[PDB]
């Protein structure tokens, strides 16, 4: 099951072509993701917590 689609927005002066990704790693805990980007930036991702599980649910749908 796919349950996020994130479209990266590239940092100033690059928008249309440069958005691309090509690296990823998780930290050793597995709670942060680092991505490397064709826009010449590193970005880091983190998990939301605030009220998530009741708002999001997934059913069964076999």
């Amino acid at each position: 099951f796919c349950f996020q689609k994130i479209q990266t927005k590239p940092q100033p002066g690059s928008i249309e072509s440069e958005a691309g990704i090509y690296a990823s790693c998780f930290d050793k805990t597995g709670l942060r993701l680092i991505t490397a980007e064709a826009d010449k930036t590193i970005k880091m991702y983190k998990e939301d917590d605030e009220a998530t599980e009741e708002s999001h649910p997934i059913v069964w749908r076999p």
């Binding site: 349950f3 996020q4 994130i6 940092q11 090509y22 690296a23 990823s24 790693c25 998780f26 930290d27 050793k28 993701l33 680092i34 991505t35 490397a36 980007e37 064709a38 010449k40 930036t41 590193i42 970005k43 880091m44 991702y45 983190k46 998990e47 939301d48 917590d49 998530t52 599980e53 999001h56």
Partner: peptide
């Protein structure tokens, strides 16, 4: 849980194509 963004580290002067922790 959903994944959320919180960094942009800018400082490479060309594409980035590796990470390792």
């Amino acid at each position: 849980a959903p994944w959320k963004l919180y960094r942009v580290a800018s400082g490479h002067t060309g594409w980035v194509r590796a990470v390792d922790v």
